[PDB]
A paper describes a structure:
Modulation of voltage-gated potassium (Kv) channels by auxiliary subunits is central to the physiological function of channels in the brain and heart. Native [name] tetrameric channels form macromolecular ternary complexes with two auxiliary β-subunits—intracellular Kv channel-interacting proteins (KChIPs) and transmembrane dipeptidyl peptidase-related proteins (DPPs)—to evoke rapidly activating and inactivating A-type currents, which prevent the backpropagation of action potentials. Here we report cryo-electron microscopy structures of the [name].2–DPP6S–[name] dodecamer complex, the [name].2–[name] and [name].2–DPP6S octamer complexes, and [name].2 alone. Thus, our data suggest that two distinct modes of modulation contribute in an additive manner to evoke A-type currents from the native [name] macromolecular complex.
The fourfold symmetrical structures of both [name].2 alone and the [name].2–[name] complex were determined to an overall resolution of 2.9 Å by single-particle cryo-EM analysis with C4 symmetry imposed. The transmembrane domain of [name].2 adopts the Shaker-type topology, with the S1–S4 voltage-sensing domain and the S5–S6 channel pore forming helices composing a homo-tetramer in a domain-swapped manner, whereby the S1–S4 voltage sensor interacts with S5 of the pore domain from the neighbouring subunit. It adopts a depolarized S4 up and S6 open conformation in both [name].2 alone and [name].2–[name]. The C-terminal intracellular S6 helix continuously extends from the transmembrane S6 helix toward [name], which was not observed in previous studies. In addition, the intracellular S6 helix interacts with the T1–S1 linker in the structure of the [name].2–[name] complex. In addition, the open conformation of [name].2 complexes revealed several [name]-specific residues involved in the intra-subunit interactions between the S4–S5 linker and S6, as well as the inter-subunit interactions between the S4–S5 linker and S5.
Numbering used by the authors:
A (entry chain D), B (entry chain A), C (entry chain B), D (entry chain C): 163 to 207, 215 to 417
The structure:
């Protein structure tokens, strides 16, 4: 550390298992992320069965912003130790941090002038994206992201073949299960749900074929789901085994 | 290109990533196929909740035939550049193209003189087989077809063993779940649906055993389904990994 | 063929792809087995909706016995060409043949003097075991039998661990889902069905947990089902790949 | 055996396939373990449909205490033949032995002074943990325990990644399926049940999405369940095959 504090605090940020301040910072950031997400889960769950976010959610507000505050300041700390400050901002981790921290300020701006319920649930949904801040803490998430980036073509073919099979089988089932007495196959988009439930070997029973023609193609769909889905599964797993092993 | 335009346009057809006209033709064919299938999906989805194919389906007609028209002319182009014209027609891709383009003309001939609903749904089902025209655009579908052709014996054994197990377990369940109060196991063909749902580990709950004898054999069927199905799954996937890798 | 017809007809029986009489015998035996099983399936499927086995089942009788007759005589032929006649009888294929042919004669003896319905459904269940007579025709069935015999210890451990996990999870679910309003977990044996449905990732929805304690252990059971079942799955498949490849 | 009886009876305990006294002790303990767990299952299955534990449980209590007494005395014999008696107690095998016999003695103390139903079912739940005493008899269970310990990090990542996906998908599903007419997605913890069932490709149909937004994310959850769960499955199986093979 022959120069200013930037590099000697960045080495603590980049390597949290060294020194003692880095470990404390790592633990406190992890604890704050965990407590924030647990608080969100808890607040999601007499005149009525009022949830824990109407009579409460004063402290659940302050607590939340406290966590957010910490995130902001630590992000500022990560802006005070980056030789590649602009490139660091362009990095995926900085993007995840910004996506995690923006909802609170966006909601504050929205509630400063007027208030609408259209972005309320949207912002609350985006608020859970602070789970992904555990990527720094856990190596497994980084390995999973690396594998998903590596086999990008395999996921593309997975999506393309899945959409193709879904369209084909939904069309077949809709045209084979249209004249039933009480049929839920009102359209091909309404048969997309049944096709994706059957292909993944999930099964729900809400939408089932009630015709001989629809049962024959309702069982081939299940077999074709195994064939289509299980082609890119090994390559994702093999990449995970290869990348994780090569890091050792 | 020392000779006529046939070979110099076939090199563009066979290789769409070369030149600039070939890329435009490839993109326009892909876009037309996609818009045709999306139009079919959309048209499949006050006096009544009238779908988008009764008040509409004038433009949905013309649009459709426009796509069909393009297919026809491009097929004619593929007939103007094939040194193996007859052999090219005998190829699988040409068969797929004719299967995709025939429904429209067949329906026109049928509606020219009288009209019946027997072939209406059949032709509408056949119309979605222009999805398979994406085989030229996507290498993954070609690899999948090559693998399915290569491991033809394993698929045959899959079908044979699946039919054998289905027959055995359907007979056992029908004769074990026949005397129930309100039983849907009226016959072995009526137990084929339950057997194929249970073997594929899908589960629907519409048809479940309600007897101790039927529950014992209704759980062995689920385990036997995993054993039977998972034998040819690796060989299909291994061939896909081998063929795709050997192309690189 | 320097000696009597026994060996020169056994070489046709053992090798059905040689000569021309052996191929005809192989095809006729396969056709008779297939028509017998199809006849059983069909006969299993106004005053009432009478099945095809009450107004019918005279020709369905004669047809059936005809098939049985053929089996008997061909078995006699296999007794006229075996140098190891006693050892051949001790073979698994001969046991399968006797198991397939006995039901008819046993039923004839039973119906000769009095008649009971206790053994009626049992004999009809045993009647489908002529499906296994396709082992001679299909090499895949023989390979599957060889693999199942080879990894006998792995199937034993599969059964033991499956029973252990089923007992543990059924006890936990019964004692966690006992005090519900309308609970189908009346006893530990009654929770065996739910446990085996959940472990195999099948799902039916007839028996589901309705308590927080029962839901936590109702989801661990599903994960533990994947772990237990997927341990002997590769070894069965790997043996199938190894044995089938080594035959080539 | 140049010294006292401790070692010459310990070799029978550690190696039950040697001599003849060890084999008798090996089978007699397994029979009493088997009959104990069967009795626990059986006891759970006019004024009312009284189970077999109220009119009975005068012979069952004697039967149960007979098994426990054998378990205790054989544990004491293992304490009279262990050179590492203090270390042997700390072993995992001895821990299971104490856990198997503790509920019976704790229950006797509990019922001596007053009686409560809070620990009545809790002690009965612990009573099935004598199933794990089969680890000595079965080599597969010992290997299964070794492989779960070997890949402890992979299971640690499985729990962390699964909690990651469960929380992320439940939050999306809860907010997308909240304004339905009769929705069971009352809260994120109430949506944890749906997520874990969907991810494991199980399917129950009690909780299903009824909105277009909830169906899109209700199908990605099923695909993401396969991706997350199938990462540590091969390493558990590969370790099991490797450890089992290296034992031979």
């Amino acid at each position: 550390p022959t120069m200013t504090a930037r590099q000697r605090v960045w080495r603590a940020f980049e390597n949290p298992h060294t020194s003692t301040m880095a470990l404390v910072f790592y633990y406190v950031t992890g604890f704050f992320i965990a407590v924030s997400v647990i608080a969100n889960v808890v607040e999601t769950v007499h005149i009525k069965e009022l949830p824990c976010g109407e009579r409460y959610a004063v402290a659940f507000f302050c607590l939340d912003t406290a966590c957010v505050m910490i995130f902001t300041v630590e992000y500022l700390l990560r802006l005070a130790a980056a030789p590649s400050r602009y490139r660091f901002v362009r990095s995926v981790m900085s993007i995840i941090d910004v996506v995690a921290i923006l909802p609170y300020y966006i909601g504050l701006v929205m509630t400063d002038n007027e208030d609408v319920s259209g972005a309320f649930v949207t912002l609350r949904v985006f608020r859970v994206f602070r789970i992904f801040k555990f990527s720094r803490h856990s190596q497994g998430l980084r390995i999973l992201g690396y594998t998903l980036k590596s086999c990008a073509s395999e996921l593309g073919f997975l999506l393309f073949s899945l959409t193709m099979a879904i369209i084909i089988f939904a069309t077949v089932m809709f045209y084979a299960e249209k004249g039933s007495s009480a049929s839920k196959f009102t359209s091909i988009p309404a048969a997309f749900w049944y096709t994706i439930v059957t292909m993944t070997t999930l099964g729900y029973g809400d939408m089932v074929p009630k015709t001989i023609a629809g049962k024959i193609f309702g069982s081939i769909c299940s077999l074709s789901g195994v064939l289509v889905i299980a082609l890119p599964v090994p390559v994702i797993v093999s990449n995970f085994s290869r990348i994780y092993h090569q890091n050792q």
